Every structure is written in C-alpha cells, then in structure tokens.
Write a protein that binds this ligand. Structure first.
Ligand SMILES: NC(=O)c1ccc[n+]([C@@H]2O[C@H](COP(=O)([O-])OP(=O)(O)OC[C@H]3O[C@@H](n4cnc5c(N)ncnc54)[C@H](O)[C@@H]3O)[C@@H](O)[C@H]2O)c1
Ligand SMILES: NC(=O)c1ccc[n+]([C@@H]2O[C@H](COP(=O)([O-])OP(=O)(O)OC[C@H]3O[C@@H](n4cnc5c(N)ncnc54)[C@H](O)[C@@H]3O)[C@@H](O)[C@H]2O)c1
Ligand code: NA
Ligand code: NA
Lengths: 320, 320
C-alpha cells in the first residue's frame, strides 16, 4: 500500500484528489502540500497531514520527501493556459523548475511519480479529430510548451534512470469543490454558477467551439487507476484520456434541461477562445482504455445534475 | 550593416562563425562572448571585441546587450548529446535557462535571434528517412529534450511578442579549427586526427550508423543566409537543413581515398551509438531550400580533402 505525497494539492484537481486518496489509503498514508494554506472554507481546512511547501525550494522539497518517504507522488503545481499567457515568467518558473525537482526526487528516492499533462500540449497541427497519442506537438501557449517539456523530460527520466513516470493528457476538468485556476475551459464551471445565481453568463469561448472535457469523478478514478497499474502493462508514459466533448451551447442546453428554464449567456470572445480553437475537438484514448482500463461513467446531463446539486451545497449558492 | 552578438563563441561553431561574421560585416560590427577566455592559440585570441560572459548571469548578459545594442544574436551555448547524458544538471541549467534569458533579451532589446536546434531533437518515432520539418518529436537524450523546448519556446516568443526567432536543426557539423564539444557526431572529426597522426581510431559509433552531417563552410553560409532573409519569406521558425549523410565506414573510405593509405579504425561501441541510432538517417530540407535558399557545396570527399589539408596547418599535426 502506498505512501502518497501530493504537491500543489489545494487547487481544483488537488482538492478532490487529496480527499479521494485519504479515503482510499487512509489519512496517515497521504501527505498533501501546497505553497498556500487551505482557506477556512476549503475542504482540507483543519485536517492533519496538510503542509506548506514551495516546490521552487528544491531543498525544502527534498526535506519533506525525506521525512514522509512517499512511494507515490502526484506533482500538480502548474500555471495553466490563459493565466500563463499573462504571467509567462511564473509559468516558466513553476512548470519547468518544480517539475525538474520533482523528477530528480523521484529518481533519488524511488518514487512513482505522476505529473499531469494537458490537451494544451497540442496545437493546430495535432490532427484534431480523435487526436492520437503520438502526433505533432505545436502548442500555441507557453503553458502548452512547458507541458511538452514535462512529458519529454519525464519520459527521459524513465528511459535513463527507470523512474516510474506516469502521465495523462487531461482534458478540461469540471468540478464543484474548488474554483478553477485559469485555463481556457474555466467557462464551463462558471456557467453553472451563473445559472444558479440567475445572472448573465458572459462566455469567452464561442458557442460552437467543442472541446474534450471530463467530470471530476471519472478524472479521480483514472488518476488512481493509472498509478495502481503494473508497470509492465503500461506501453507508454503519457496517455490521452477524455470523458466527452462539448461546446458552450451544448453545456447551456444541458443546464436548461436540468434546471427546466432558460439561462442567459452572451458569447463575447475572450483570450480563452483563440487558445481553445488551437486544441483538439476530441481525443483518441484507446491506449489508456486498453493498457490500464480508463473509463467514463458520466455524461453531460449526469454531470449537470450533480454540479447543480453540489455547487449550492459547497459554495452556499441559491438552488433549484 | 547588422550589429551581431554571438554568445558561446569560442566553441566549434562559434569559432568559425565569429570569423565569418567579422569578415562579412566588419570587426567593429561583431561582438562575441564566452564563459571562458580564449587560449593563446585560439583563432579569436588577441582580437578586439571578444568578451568573457557567463550567459547564466542574466544581469551580465543584459549589460552586454544594452552596451552593444545588437540587431542580431547567435546564441550558441548548450551542452550537447553525449556530454548532456553524463552531466544532465548542467545541460538543463545551460540549455533551458541561458535560452530563456536570450529570448527575453531579444524581446526586450529588439534582436533577431538565432538559436540552433539539432537532429538530436528527434527520436525513434520521427520517420527516420528524409525526416520532415513537422513530425513526432520524442528525443531520447536530455539535450534533445531541451532543444525541443528551445524550438517551441522560441516559436511562442515569435507568436506572442513578434520576436524574430529563427532556427535550424543542425546535423553533425564537421570542421578543423576548434575541436567538438561532446556530441554523438564527434568521432568524425577525431577520425581525421587519427589518420594524420597514423594512430588507431577507436570509434564509439558503429560502422553502418548513417547520420546527417554538414561541412562548416556550408553551415556558415546557411547561418548567415537564414538571418539575412526577410521575415516574410520564412514560412516557419525552425528548419531542417542537411549537407549529406554518412556512416563511420563511409567516412573511413573517404579519408583513405584522400590519404592513399589505410587508417586503422576499431569499432568499440560507446554511449554515442545508442544516442545516434535514435536519430534520422537523413533529413528533408526542402522548406529551407525553398524559403531562404539553403544550399550545399561540399560532398564527403571535398570535405575530407579540405580537412586533411587544414588540420596540419591549424593544429601542427603531420601533413600530407
Ligand atoms: N483543471 C484542468 O482542467 C486541468 C486540465 C489539464 C491539466 N491540468 C493539470 O493539472 C494540474 C493541477 O491543475 P489544477 O486545475 O488543479 O490547477 P490549480 O491552479 O487549481 O491548482 C494549482 C495549485 O498549485 C499550487 N502551486 C502554485 N505554485 C506552487 C509552488 N511553487 N509550490 C507548490 N504549490 C504551488 C497553487 O497554490 C494551487 O493550489 C496542473 O499540472 C495542470 O496543468 C489541469
Ligand atoms: N557542433 C555540432 O555538430 C552541432 C550540431 C547541432 C547543433 N549544435 C548546436 O550549436 C551550438 C554550438 O555548438 P558547438 O558545437 O559550437 O558547441 P561547443 O561545445 O563546441 O561550444 C559551446 C561553447 O559554449 C560555451 N559556453 C558553455 N556554457 C556557457 C555559458 N554559461 N555562457 C557562455 N558560454 C558558454 C563553451 O565555453 C563553448 O565555448 C549549440 O547550441 C549546439 O547544441 C551543434
Ligand atoms: Na474545437
Ligand atoms: Na542512422
């Protein structure tokens, strides 16, 4: 049974992942860290086994790994697609350096290490329908560029040192618990909050711009499952996974079907649009399905029903 | 006349490039720098406009740029294929960080910036025969990884900030003046030394491992030409260029025709071999030929002739 370290643990993925790992392997077997502390409303506030770590401090990062002695690590800090364009130096610092430190520690301390990649690693030469695991990588964002680096450096650590590096290219991830951290797909979570607040949604992504997406439970299931898999079953280090593709107008219809009313959305292009338009419309994840059993239980309407219930509960919004 | 800065100038490529730039544009229009000073026999010893600069010192780098006000920069420092595998920390520090500082200075000070990439950016999924400009990039060395990162980051600077970033993927470069710095293609220059010394060459690359190569004068012609080109002629930022491909056994034959004697070569595999076996056999450089007129004068025997003539002259070895 693993000892699991999670870095960048208090963001959107880390929040749900930390809780899932604690529930599955026990609180004692999981250490959760982040450069900031949980806010008093955060789901991890008050819990033991939650520490402060700046992953840019390699010596600090090493210290924490030395005492906890993880056998697995999920390294989650990164600056994402939209925010990276506005804060590229921070993106380059975090996405490149913390990753290098994390891999070097996985090597030194024999840790199975997960570092998520992203559909943002792709650009407009990727082949955009059912994009393959191996294709041309020409990302149009610095974030995407740093993630191509992460995939390649991770794979080199595997080849060179036998570090058990594992990764998935995550689509847009939808969840209710922690608000998203500045990717091009953040509109989707915000459209649900707008609909519950009964306010105008100003959606920065164009109405028919379809993207690969996934609801958090399927994401967590796959994050754990790829890490539990035997090394010998994995034919590669980095795997596309997807849940289902949708455009904003499809998301809108879902919400309207579940709320049984119209919601108002104005499509005014923001920076997310040119970025999203460069990305795949859908991914081929057959390698992941075949090698380690990636699977998808939610569709858009099951997601919408769950989001519409969970947001009022977790954030105190009005409900249906 | 451009004002040209060359960083990492005392190495194999920098040595001849610095001399060619000084001849073409005038010594007063060219400033070159390196982390070390030239030795008394270095061809740039004793010359004006040769400075000591560590490109990891971003302050120092910026001070030199600000004083000189280059309009062009050739940013050459990197730790190469073989040496990188043995010193990967240095490779990551140099190849990533000096490149980031270079691109930022090109943005900040309006410099057309050349940073070479390499055939080592490719690995074994590239399509090994006549490799295309756009293909799967899966390098198996940390050096190659850092160069994919260099191509993509430079390209992003071009898109995001209008930075005029230009690159070629260089094949193995052959020259006589300054000895090579630890690439997988270094055997070739050393075989010419062995021949003139009439000493046994122990060759770490296997006899039929064919690689893209180019002789220096063609390389210099292309390095200036791609930089003279008008921006609007360039359909891309990164170009394959090649001279011709050869294996060690072909090189040996070529040296033997020119010397009219047997060289003794023993094949004892070293790290260079596995590295080189993941690379293309040959490149497609049509985009370069078409966009900016990349062209090649030498073939293997002209190269060998010129190498065997110049090495005695340049290094005091025994002639023919
Ligand atoms: N959410 C998505 O839809 C999505 C999609 C594809 C990939 N990803 C990837 O998943 C990972 C996490 O994404 P997220 O949505 O949870 O992001 P987020 O922005 O919600 O969370 C990032 C967390 O990292 C922390 N962090 C920042 N700098 C740090 C440092 N120096 N040291 C330690 N922690 C630091 C932040 O405080 C924050 O809690 C990233 O690698 C991201 O690229 C996310
Ligand atoms: N020679 C080849 O066959 C070849 C092939 C493909 C690509 N390249 C690329 O061409 C460039 C130059 O290659 P080269 O063969 O001349 O390399 P080299 O090792 O011969 O020379 C590199 C020079 O850079 C200097 N340097 C190292 N660290 C530095 C620092 N921190 N600051 C300033 N200078 C520093 C070294 O002192 C040396 O003079 C590199 O980017 C390399 O990857 C070379
Ligand atoms: Na799309
Ligand atoms: Na070859």
């Amino acid at each position: 049974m693993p000892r699991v370290l999670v870095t960048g643990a208090l963001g959107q993925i880390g929040t749900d992942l930390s809780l899932a790992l604690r529930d599955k392997f026990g609180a004692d077997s999981v250490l959760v860290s982040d450069v900031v502390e949980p806010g008093a409303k955060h789901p991890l506030a008050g819990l033991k086994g939650v520490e402060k770590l700046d992953c840019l401090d390699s010596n600090g990062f090493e210290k924490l790994v030395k005492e906890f002695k993880p056998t697995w690590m999920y390294h989650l800090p990164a600056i994402m697609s939209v925010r990276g364009e506005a804060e590229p130096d921070l993106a380059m610092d975090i996405n490149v350096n913390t990753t290098r430190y994390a891999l070097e520690l996985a090597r030194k301390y024999n840790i199975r290490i997960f570092i998520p990649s992203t559909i943002a690693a792709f650009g407009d030469k990727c082949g955009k329908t059912m994009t393959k695991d191996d294709t041309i990588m020409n990302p149009s964002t610095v974030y995407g560029v740093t993630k191509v680096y992460t995939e390649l450096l991770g794979t080199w650590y595997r080849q060179k040192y036998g570090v058990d590096f594992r990764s998935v290219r995550l689509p847009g991830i939808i969840s209710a618990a922690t608000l998203p951290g500045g990717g091009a797909t953040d509109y989707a979570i915000h459209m649900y909050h707008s609909a519950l607040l009964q306010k105008k949604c100003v959606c920065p992504v164009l109405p028919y711009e379809s993207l690969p997406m996934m609801y958090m439970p399927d994401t967590l299931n796959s994050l754990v499952k790829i890490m539990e898999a035997p090394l010998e079953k994995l034919t590669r280090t980095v795997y596309n996974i997807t849940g289902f593709s949708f455009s904003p107008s499809e998301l809108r219809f879902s919400i309207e079907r579940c709320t049984d009313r119209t919601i108002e959305v104005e499509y005014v292009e923001g920076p997310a649009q040119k970025i999203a338009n460069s990305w795949p419309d859908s991914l081929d994840d057959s390698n992941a399905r075949n090698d380690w059993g990636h699977q998808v239980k939610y569709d858009i309407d099951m997601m919408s029903e769950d989001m519409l219930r969970q947001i009022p509960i977790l954030h105190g919004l009005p409900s249906l």
